[PDB]
């Protein structure tokens, strides 16, 4: 089998907090560790962040760190005895005037006044990611009086949303502003914004991140009905980001699970067309929380995401809280490898008939065209400062390995989420100009990726100091004297 | 929202044995009831068969009955209680001599004489489609003594295989020969053959079925590595059948779960190209055994099967043994409807450039072409004897309703598994020839499917008595005087 | 070789006026005789019209008659001596005020009052169908002072036009109004309008033709720069007609020879898209005026028109005035047959993805689809009243013979210009309804077009009296008992 | 309009022998002068060759010289009185036994032993390039007895051929071997072989040319039925050549005029696929022998050759013997420019799905891909030694100017026949390496082809001395500091 191209995002948590498990996850092949700021303390995150970077370096791997902002997720308050159980037909109330610590079998408090204002009789409310469902029977100034449609347990601080969406909330909370600073302070590679509705929400988050001196790239989580209402809404949000996440948990609540299949495919495609990275997420291997093997549906879900040409697939509870975090990563990685053998994973239309905007864009596209048609080419050596050039290369369907050669750590980590891209640390400026090409080829010969007789593509610009000036494509024969 | 086109196969069992639940399944929209002959007594099947047909007729629905032969897959015997639970590290024994009804927590019997010959110390055994895994620690003359590697439940007649591959029975079992007679005696609409390897296995089954006077159509279950080894193997097996099933449980064990995605798609496509019906099966909504809603992976799995253009999707334990059989069917039906709104579900290339063989094939194809391009057409009235004509129509991607008008019950049930086809009972021979067209159009006007001003396609042959002579296509305006 | 599908229009004149030559032209395969009203007396036309119809009937052929209106010719006045000769660089003047009777080597008069208003310095003037070319050097109050660009002879009443057009003239002259009546009186099948500018000119001609009781179909000659200025101009003119003619003589003068290739292709395509007939004309085999074989350029020109999917190709002086009218028709017919063997002549996209408007349109399209894919089909029996149904069929690329079965003479002749359509005289209303199918099939068996074992398509409507109700397509096996 | 891309080959002769006319032809835009060795003396050719090269240099143009070998004619013997005249309907005989000097009004001898074997009753025989045509009425053991179909004169040693071809003769005659030496001695850029049958004939010609020290590229004239008998025959002959010519005069005789259109298109396409140059020839503007303007058929013929994507179009008698050689070239050039504006002239599929063989091939293809999609690119600077790299570039449909930068005269002339390629004399080896790019860009700035702000593609290899090592593509912004 070939080296896996689709990247794996693994959420960390109680089940993946020790050095022994993190080491095993690194070895199993995680490419990105997600730190969910909805839970844990700042120091818990710092400790994990330090440990993943240490253990990655220990094994010559490049793992990005993604920080996930909680967002304006609306939660219930606490219960007196920490949890309750509800049956179909039971009556239940959400009250702004009920004490936050005194939840009972009949009522719980909520610290969000506009919840009651935005809801009306008939609205369906979904709690704990849809596990419990209620319908609003009566509205008063301070509470919603409901009937349970689908029973189950309820416990402190569980999430609530309305079927259809449309709830008022700010995109950035005060917690999120603090977490943005925390992310900048930890030098996180990616930061994910929850529940954005339009480009403004992402621009605001970008402002705050730069103001805090953060260099992270921004991920827009597509979880709101308004974000997918039409192509302009979606494309606007995508263009304001560096990456997007198909956040199927909250999105499914907002638009209905029966609409997910079409929207997942649209989001991935529109992301790639706008030269952004895309992640597919949520319940991809849920059964592995309690089982050491996935279901056939789970295998199919992941494989189909790979054929949709997602950059990465994500684990949440499977890796953060479940009994088999390492086995989940292993299984996910194996399914990705299998799906990548399909003929549709390697054949491209190469954006025929379209208009290119930039010069560096053109060299990237020209290289993918060349590599996909001259099969003697076994690798692409992309000398890059910020990772932009191999971002463009990896938007094109191919099975050729793309190597991002960079001296910077920021870049070496960034590309870990790019489908088909591997990092090779390399500093061309600190070498005699005439020796750069053979030096780059040496790095692949060391690793056994290419041998004498194979061909390779090298891309670069004129200087080795500025960014955004890729303008050259060379096709080199491994074995020849390379200038 | 439009009428669902993708068909639902629901396996019956303990959870779906009563008249109250079967009535609810019929109302929830099942199109085919599967009777798994691996479990239950002949009279249990007869009782369920009678009840489904009665309850379907009660609600003006046409539900086929599919009988699933156990096949030469090797199974364990019964337990004293029905089931046990095993933990990692537990010891367990498979014995040729142990009583077949007295299985315990420590040993179960097995009707496989070569057990000790085929297995050896170190071999891994897989039970229940890989869910439980054991390693052989000791071999004796009549038993295998094992340690559990992966725990889980075990129950009567669960499948067992060896990781190398050496468990199997040769060609059609004696049980199956008896069940073929039982199927013929019950007038089953479909019969499924397990573990077929090539056209010969299906021809043998067809011989036995016709010898017993059975009119059922044959379903080849694709579960053996040899059946998908190459296109000739697969196409041979498909051509010898009337329908095929993507049996992902056993198939995943035989070829590995990482290869399923590509093969599922190939099987569906090759089936449709050879004008056969295709079912996708196994663990599509497994979490609904214990939960009243599916996971996102399960939603995705089903939806993607619909976009692959499967005829039907299947439930096994979800409907047969689980806690929420009705909710599973409802959920599956809702996901199908959502996926059918996708633009790829309705647009066809119409087999351009290909060569047709038959005349009735040509009229079917010509009607789908016409309907897909003249949007005034709201339905296709296909007068058919055996259901062959609407079989061909439904191989072509479309969203136009196909109505199979037939006088025969055999046909009225058969087409229940055809994607996009609805039955309208109708006897053209018992009418004055000049009144047939308006009589057929009346049936759709009664049901509110078409109104005055809509157009319709009618297909038929010259006589109303023979089969295989469809040769006419008419385009009629609802409102006009129809000859 | 197969029966030629592309139709041949042959202009009559002095070289093709006798019964012996007309008989030879009929036998050589002409499908339409063009009567150019620019020359000849009314009785000369009547005599030829009668003779072609007589001789066609004598040999079981269906030849249409097309009457070509002269239109608005702008001409110079007379020269004092009979003819003058000009050399490149010579000076020459056109004067509104000079005496029209005697012209000199330096100046000629002209009956064009707007001359000085319409023309300007730099304009190129083309005389005698482009044979002489001049450029306007100076404009004075009553004359244009020119330099000769291309020399040659000039004589009394030669035509003059301006590169670009914009000379004022009505499309219908008083002569043309008289000729429209003459055409109606002769029962001409087609009438061609010269120099129309827009749909209004064609609607006016249609009014006059119906007022005179004429049943002819109208041909718009695309000869004016204004007619091809943009798609709306062209499409408007096409939609107002039944057929169009790529009139490359005058059109080349108006837009320049270097623009012809693109516009010829556009006109043909837009005509077919709007379900109109199209003729390609002018100098297709000019060398055959004086030679018994065509040049390779002439062969190429005709063949390329056939691959552009023109309905017909035309001869003008080659058949009307030249030394080898019969040999020209024979050569043209042979080149058509050769080009029709090309793979692009028989393969169609079948208007996939498009939206159909009418029901009879749908049956026509459905038949071409069916015939192009079921190769057992050797003919299409199209029962038609007015020829509309086979008009639509013949817009689709195919090599299957289309037979227009009609009782009417108007229709039997009309379809002679339709590519791939042959007339079979037939009256279904005068037969017992149940015997029609086999009666139609008999007509093809008589002619040896189909034999026992071949298949055929029959199209018709419900009654045999009304027009515009084709709604049925049947596929029949020649040899079976046909109802 | 833009600069013409399709190249013009003009045959020289009595009408184009003077310095005044040659100068006018150079200024009118000829790209290649053809020296037909069938006529003229060695010194007549030398004088013309010297004059075209002198006059081209005088006007900064690069005109190749093509030498056309006469090849094999089969000829009749002598007449008693040197010539006779034959009329339509006359009887005439060709006899293998009749005295070779005593030809009469009724019979002539012939030194063709297989005459009776090769010809048969019904065959048409063409003498003196088609001036006389006969049909064979009877065959006897030593003669063919014929009827004259087309009359004319006959004289000693006139050529004879059969419709259908198949007469035995070797591709290279003794005259041709002498002319190969003459071509080498004159340093001709191209040599054309007449009536080759297969790769062997072209390899033999290449041997003789190299043996004589000739550097010319070889043109295979496709005129023999055997050369187009199937794809292997044709492709074999193409692969053994550098260029091919669609020789429609002799080819039409050998396969029939009705087959030319399809074969012209096949030859052009197969030539381009195998990376060869292709010329379309013969009677493209024949009427211009005696007229100063072409017919519409001639305009169409040339334009359609341009849309078929021929590299060049040729004139023979139009430029060599006719009354208007300069006007013919001007007209041909104008028609080419018009046809090049068509949208199909600029859009390419870019050999999607295909497999490339070489590295320099890959850079050429990658540049055409890049140029066709980044419209900021206004030119391609191709540094080439032998012209191979811009040969490959020009196989791809585009409207971007391709500039072949070369120091060698051999190369500067060679590319004159390549569609869309212009020569820029340039010696990169004689410059400081760091100044090459801006030096090349200066050459285009001098000529006003590009301005500040435009982009350009530059291709090259590592050294500036070896051939066959193009391996680099750069995209440069005109105005920036170019390394
Ligand atoms: O745009 P980026 O990929 O960030 O890379 C940009 C840079 O990469 C190259 O290897 C060199 O460092 C520069 O020549 C170029 O400008
Ligand atoms: O649809 P099939 O099973 O091929 O049978 C086709 C039959 O359908 C109906 O009975 C039609 O009215 C008959 O004319 C035809 O023979
Ligand atoms: O082809 P059209 O001119 O529309 O006429 C179509 C007509 O042809 C059929 O043979 C019958 O005559 C009618 O059923 C029909 O109306
Ligand atoms: O296109 P070709 O004939 O192979 O010539 C291309 C060759 O010459 C040019 O000077 C290039 O700069 C060389 O580096 C290359 O090897
Ligand atoms: Mg099975
Ligand atoms: Mg020749």
**Domain with A115 in it:** 72-170
DSSP code per residue over C373-439: H-TTEEEEEEE-SSSHHHHHHTTS---SPEEEEES-HHHHHHGGGSTTEEEEE--GGGS-GGGHHHH
Q: ∠ CA B246-B247-B252 to the nearest 5 degrees?
A: 110
**CB contact set of B229 (below 8 Å; sequence gap of 6+):** none
CA-to-CA dists, residue C260 to B398, D295, D301, D335, angstroms? 43, 12, 11, 9
Do residues A418 and A436 lie in contact, with contact meaning Cβ atoms separated by under 8 Å? Answer: no
Task: Tell me which DSSP letter residue D383 carries.
Answer: E
In a domain, D396, yes or no: yes
Residue nearest to atom 16 of ligand 1 (CA): A469
Query: DSSP letter string over D262-297?
Result: HHHHHHHHHHHHTT-EEEEESSTTGGGGT-SS--HH
d(CA A457, CA A478): 10
Indicate the residue of D350, D351, D373 with minimum beta-carbon distance to A356. Answer: D373
| CB within 8 Å: C359 and B455 | yes
Q: C166 and C176: one domain?
A: no
Query: Which atom of ligand 4 is nearest to D461's Cα?
Result: 14
Structural domain ending residue among the three candidates A295, A314, A339: A339
Could you tell me the distance, in angstroms and rounded to a whole number, from the CA of residue A118 to the centre of ligand 3?
63
First to last CA, chain D: 34
Contact D362 A475 (CB under 8 A): yes
Catalytic residue among B4, B5, B7, B34: B34
Task: Pick C474's closest partner by Cβ from B373, B374, B471.
Answer: B471
Residues C226, C208 share a domain: yes
CB contact under 8 A, C472 and B473: yes
To the nearest 10°, report the CA torsion of D406, D407, D408, D409: 90
Final residue belonging to a domain, choices D322, D339, D356: D339
Contact call for residues D340 and C262 (beta carbons, < 8 A): no
Of the CA atoms within 13 Å of residue C34, those in its CB half-sphere come to: 28
Q: Which two tokens stand for residue D187?
A: 């340093």
Q: Residue C207 and residue C191: Cα distance in Å, rounded?
A: 13
Cβ atoms of D196 and D220 within 8 Å: the answer is yes
Is C373 in contact with B365 (Cβ distance < 8 A)? Answer: yes
| Burial bucket for residue B89 (CB in 10 Å: 0-12, 13-18, 19+) | exposed
The DSSP secondary-structure symbol of B292 reads S
- Closest of A440, A457, A310, A297 to residue A375, by C-alpha: A457
Structure determination method: X-ray
C near D: at least 3 beta-carbon pairs less than 8 Å apart: yes
Residue B160 Cα to ligand 5 midpoint, Å, equals 11
Q: Both A21 and A158 in a single domain?
A: no
- Is A34 one of the catalytic residues? yes
Establish if A290 touches chain B: CB-CB under 8 angstroms: no
- Asked whether residue B230 falls in the same domain as residue B330, the answer is yes
| Interface-testing mutation among A267, A284, A297, A328, with chain B (most B C-beta atoms within 10 A) | A297
Q: At which of B129, B152, B170 does a domain end?
A: B170
Q: Give Cβ neighbours of residue D84 (< 8 Å, ≥ 6 apart).
A: D103, D104, D105, D153, D154, D155
Cβ–Cβ < 8 Å for B32, B3? no
Of C163, C223, C155, C180, which is closest to residue C68 (Cα–Cα)? C180
Which resolution in angstroms does this entry have? 2.4
D62/D15 same-domain check? yes
Q: CA distances (Å), D439 to each of C167, D367, D401, D404, D443, in order?
A: 53, 20, 18, 14, 7
Which two three-digit tokens encode residue C291?
A: 């030679």
Distances (CA, A) of B225 to B198, B234, B252, B255, B260: 11, 10, 9, 6, 11
In this complex, the chains that touch D, judged by 3 or more CB pairs closer than 8 A, are A, C
In this structure, the answer to whether residues B237 and B351 fall within a common structural domain is: no
CA-to-CA distance for C169 and C115, rounded, in angstroms?
12
**B205 in reach of chain A (CB within 8 A):** no
Of the residues A34, A73, A206, A414, only one is catalytic, namely: A34
Chain A environment of D373 (Cβ under 8 Å)? 351, 354-356, 362, 365
The answer, yes or no, to whether any atom of ligand 4 lies below 6 A from the CB of D427, is: no
CA D461 to chain centre: 30
A334 is annotated as an active-site residue = no
Atom 14 in ligand 1: which residue has the minimum CA distance? A461
Distance CA D391, CA D470 (A): 13
**D483: CA distance to ligand 3 center in Å?**
76
CB contact under 8 A, B366 and C366: yes
- Cα(B192)–Cα(B66) distance, integer angstroms: 7
Q: Are residues B203 and B162 in the same domain?
A: no
Ion ligand 5 nearby residues (CB, 5 A): B 223, 250
Within a domain: B483: no
> How would you list the strands of the sheet with B160-162, edge to edge?
B107-109, B91-95, B143-150, B132-139, B124-127, B160-162
H or E element: which one contains C147? Answer: strand C143-150
Residue C386: how many CA atoms within 13 Å on its side-chain side? 13
Query: Does C130 contact chain D (CB < 8 Å)?
Result: yes
Residues of chain A with Cβ-Cβ distance to D354 below 8 Å are 373
Six-digit token string for B53:
């047909």
B344 touches chain A (CB under 8 A): no
Mutation site, D347, D369, D434, interface A, largest A CB count within 10 A: D369
Dist. CA B58–CA B52, nearest whole Å? 10
Closest CA to B328 of B360, B302, B362, B350: B302
Chain D residues closer than 8 Å to A477 by CB: 359
Distances (CA, A) of C456 to B471, C5, C400, C407, D176: 11, 18, 10, 21, 58
Q: Give the C-alpha distances (Å, rounded to integers) separating B211 from B180, B207, B294, D460.
A: 10, 6, 43, 77
Tokens at A217, concatenated: 């790239």
Shortest distance between the Cα of B205 and any Cα of chain A, in A, equals 29
Distance of alpha carbon B245 from alpha carbon B279, whole angstroms: 5
Here the CATH number for the domain that contains residue D55 is: 3.20.20.60
State how many domains chain C has. 3
Query: What residue of C is the nearest CA neighbor of B362?
Result: C370
Q: Does chain C touch chain B (at least 3 C-beta pairs within 8 Å)?
A: yes
Catalytic residue status for B221: yes
Identify whether residues D335 and D347 lie together within a single domain. Answer: no
Cβ partners under 8 Å of residue B254, min gap 6: B165, B223, B224, B225
CB–CB contact A355 D375 (8 Å): yes
Q: Which ligand is nearest to the CA of C470?
A: 3
Question: Does residue C296 sit in the same domain as residue C281?
Answer: yes
| Residue A339 parent element (H or E) | helix A325-340
Number of C-alpha atoms within 13 angstroms, CB side, residue B38?
Answer: 25
Name which of A136, A155, A132 is nearest A144 in CA terms: A136
Please state the φ and ψ torsions of residue D165, each to the nearest 5 degrees: 80, -145
Distance from CA of B351 to the nearest CA of C (A): 9
Q: Is residue A482 part of a domain?
A: no
Instruction: Write down how long chain B is.
Output: 483
Burial class of residue B453 in the structure, from the number of CB atoms within 10 Å of its CB (0-12 exposed, 13-18 middle, 19+ buried): exposed
* b/e burial code for range B176-214 (CB count within 10 A of at least 16 → b): beebbbbbbebbbbbbbbbbbbbbebbeebbebbeeeeb
The neighbour count for residue D185, using CB atoms within 10 Å, is 13
- Let me know whether C429 and C301 are in one domain: no
Pick from C405, C411, C457, C461 the residue to mutate for probing ligand 3's pocket: most ligand atoms within 8 Å of its CB.
C461
Chain B partners within 8 Å of A294 (Cβ): 257
What is the residue-wise DSSP string for A150-169? Answer: E-EEEETT-EEEETT-----
Residue D21: phi and psi, rounded to 5, are: -75, -45
Distance CA(A26)–CA(A33), nearest Å, equals 9
| φ, ψ (nearest 5 deg) of residue D158 | -70, 150
Mutation choice for ligand 4 from D361, D381, D384, D437, CB with most ligand atoms inside 8 A: D384
SS3 track for chain A = CCCCCCEEEEECCHHHCCHHHHHHHHHHCCCEEEEECCCCCHHHHHHHHHHHHHHHHHCCCCCEEEEECCCCCEEECCECCCEEEECCCCEEEEECCCCCCCECCCEEEECCHHHHHHCCCCCEEEECCCCEEEEEEEECCCEEEEEEEECEEEECCCEEEECCCCCCCCCCCHHHHHHHHHHHHCCCCEEEECCCCCHHHHHHHHHHHHHCCCCCEEEEEECCHHHHCCHHHHHHHHHCCCEEEEEHHHHHHHHCHHHHHHHHHHHHHHHHHCCCEEEEECCCCHHHHCCCCCCHHHHHHHHHHHHCCCCEEEECHHHHCCCCHHHHHHHHHHHHHHHHCCHHHCCCCCCCCCCCCCHHHHHHHHHHHHHHHCCCEEEEEEECCCCHHHHHHCCCCCCCCEEEEECCHHHHHHHHHCCCEEEEECCHHHCCHHHHHHHHHHHHHHCCCCCCCCEEEEEECCCCCCCCCCCEEEEEEECECCC
Asked whether D345 and D397 are in contact (CB, 8 A), the reply is yes
Return the structure tokens found at C181.
């009546």
C482 lies in a domain?
Answer: no
| CA contacts within 13 A on the Cβ side of D341 | 12
CA-to-CA dists, residue D351 to A38, A352, A397, C5, angstroms: 52, 11, 17, 34
> Of all protein residues, whose CA lies closest to atom 12 belonging to ligand 2?
B460
**Distances from the Cα of D41 to the Cα of D37, D45, D172, D191, angstroms:** 8, 7, 19, 17
Whether A244 and A220 have beta carbons less than 8 Å apart is answered as: yes
Mutation pick from A347, A350, A369, A478 vs chain D, by most beta carbons of D within 10 Å, is A369
Give the pair of three-digit tokens for residue B348.
């066809």
Would the CB of C431 count as within 6 Å of ligand 3?
Answer: no
Q: How far apart are CA D445 and CA D442, in angstroms?
A: 5
Residue B482 falls within a domain, yes or no? no
**Residues of chain A with C-beta less than 8 angstroms from the C-beta of B285:** 297
Q: Are residues A320 and A410 in the same domain?
A: no
Distance CA C15, CA C48 (A): 12
> Is residue B353 within 8 angstroms of chain C, CB to CB?
yes
DSSP-based three-state secondary structure for B271? helix
The whole-angstrom separation of Cα A413 and Cα D51 is 68
Q: How far is B253 from chain A (nearest CA, A)?
A: 11
Q: What phi, psi does C160 have (nearest 5°)? A: -135, 140
Residue C461 CB less than 6 A away from ligand 3: yes
Q: Would you call B334 an interface residue with chain A, using a CB distance cutoff of 8 Å?
A: yes
CB A157 within 8 A of CB A127: no
Please name the member of A373, A472, A476 whose beta carbon is closest to the beta carbon of D355: A373
Q: A362 to chain D: which residues are within 8 Å by CB?
A: 370, 373-374, 475
For residues B8 and B141, state if they share a domain: no
Which residue has the CA at smallest separation from atom 16 of ligand 4? D469
Helix (H, G, I), strand (E, B) or coil at D452: coil
Name the token pair of D398. Answer: 């585009």
- How many other C-beta atoms lie within 10 A of the C-beta of residue A168? 12
Chains that touch A (3 or more CB pairs under 8 A): B, D
Ligand 1 lined by A420 (C-beta under 6 Å): no
- φ and ψ at residue D279, rounded to 5 degrees: -115, 135
In terms of Cβ atoms closer than 10 Å to its own Cβ (0-12, 13-18, 19+), residue C388 is buried
Taking CB atoms and an 8 Å cutoff, what residues of chain A touch B299? Answer: 252, 257-258, 260-261
Residue keyed to tokens 């030694």: D385
Integer Cα distance of B386 and B467 in angstroms: 7
Which sign, positive or negative, has the C-alpha torsion A289, A294, A296, A299? positive
D482 inside domain:
no
Domain for residue C457, yes or no? yes
| Residue D152 domain-assigned (yes or no) | yes
Longest dimension (CA), chain B: 82
């Amino acid at each position: 089998m070939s080296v896996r191209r689709t990247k794996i995002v693994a959420t960390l948590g109680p089940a993946s907090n020790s050095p022994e498990v993190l080491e095993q996850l690194i070895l199993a092949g995680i490419d990105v560790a997600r730190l969910n700021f909805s839970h844990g303390t700042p120091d818990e995150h710092r400790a994990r962040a330090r440990l993943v970077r240490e253990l990655a370096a220990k094994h010559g791997r490049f793992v990005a760190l993604l920080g996930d902002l909680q967002g304006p997720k609306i939660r219930i308050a606490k219960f007196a005895n920490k949890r309750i159980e509800l049956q179909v037909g039971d009556k239940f109330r959400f009250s702004t005037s009920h004490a936050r610590d005194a939840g009972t079998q009949e009522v719980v408090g909520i610290d969000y006044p506009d919840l009651v204002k935005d809801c009306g009789v008939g609205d369906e409310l979904l709690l704990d990611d849809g596990r419990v469902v209620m319908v609003v029977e009566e509205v008063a100034a301070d509470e919603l009086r409901c009937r349970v449609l689908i029973g189950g347990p309820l416990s402190d601080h569980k999430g609530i949303n309305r079927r259809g969406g449309g709830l008022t909330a700010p995109a950035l909370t005060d917690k999120d502003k603090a977490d943005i600073k925390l992310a900048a302070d930890m030098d996180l590679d990616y930061v994910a914004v929850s529940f954005p509705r339009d480009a403004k929400d992402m621009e605001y988050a970008r402002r705050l991140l730069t103001e805090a001196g953060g260099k992270a790239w921004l991920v827009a989580k597509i979880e709101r009905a308004e974000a997918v209402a039409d192509d302009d809404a979606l494309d606007g949000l995508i263009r304001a980001s560096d990456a997007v996440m198909v956040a199927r948990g909250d999105l499914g609540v907002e638009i209905g699970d029966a609409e997910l299949v079409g929207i997942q495919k649209k989001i991935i495609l529109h992301a790639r067309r706008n030269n952004k990275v895309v992640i597919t997420a949520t319940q991809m291997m849920e059964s592995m929380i309690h089982s050491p093997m996935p279901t056939r549906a789970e295998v199919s879900d992941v494989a189909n995401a790979v054929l949709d040409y997602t950059d990465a697939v994500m684990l949440s509870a499977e890796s953060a809280a479940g009994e088999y975090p390492v086995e989940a990563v292993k299984a996910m990685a194996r399914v990705c490898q299998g799906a990548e053998k399909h003929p549709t994973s390697q054949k491209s239309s190469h954006r025929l008939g379209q208009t290119f905007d930039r010069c560096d864009e053109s060299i990237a596209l020209a290289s993918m065209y060349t590599a996909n048609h001259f099969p003697g080419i076994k690798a692409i050596i992309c000398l890059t400062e910020s990772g932009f050039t191999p971002l463009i290369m990896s938007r094109i369907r191919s099975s050729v390995p793309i190597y991002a050669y960079s001296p910077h750590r920021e870049t070496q980590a960034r590309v870990a989420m790019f489908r088909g891209v591997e990092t090779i640390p390399f500093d061309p400026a600190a070498l005699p100009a005439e020796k750069v090409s053979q030096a780059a080829v040496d790095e692949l010969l060391k690793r056994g990726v290419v041998t004498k007789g194979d061909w390779v593509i090298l891309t670069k610009g004129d200087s080795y100091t500025a960014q955004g000036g890729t303008n050259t494509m060379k096709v080199l024969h491994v074995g020849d004297l390379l200038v």
